[PDB]
Symmetry: C2
Subunit: 85 residues, 2 copies
């Protein structure tokens, strides 16, 4: 199964919602940039890079098909976020 093989992030100091900008590498072969760690009072999460669509709303530019893989990415990213000064 596909693995997150690298996580690179830069923490941001603010009281805004966006806490870090993140790049992940999948199977040592493909890099996705502009993920973010977001903090709200409902908890921490990792968002995919996204765009405003011809609406209206924002949609992920790149994303897992299966929600289990979304959690996998989040766990891998948050692991590194916690390790980061």
């Amino acid at each position: 199964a596909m693995k997150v093989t690298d996580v690179r992030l830069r923490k941001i100091q603010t009281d805004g919602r966006m806490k870090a900008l993140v790049s992940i590498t999948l199977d040592e072969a493909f890099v996705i940039h502009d993920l973010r760690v977001i903090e709200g009072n409902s908890g921490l999460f990792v968002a995919m890079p996204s765009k405003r669509t011809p609406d209206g709303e924002f949609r992920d530019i790149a994303h897992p098909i299966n929600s289990d893989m979304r959690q996998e990415i989040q766990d891998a990213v948050m692991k590194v976020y916690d390790e980061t000064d």
Copy 2:
């Protein structure tokens, strides 16, 4: 070595301009990347990566292959479909 492009969704665009198609790909039946673009370059058609405009007029490429096998697989899988498309 590379993951496989297991699905390609492609829409041709008709124009004199250099963007000839908008493309979404799926890797190993598990991960989707949208807004790849088939581009007419000086030396022929190629596949460019999702590129997000910044609020200051520049662009950021959101996803790229980081090895040769992965790079060639994207170009090959997408252009294969482009060339099958009327």
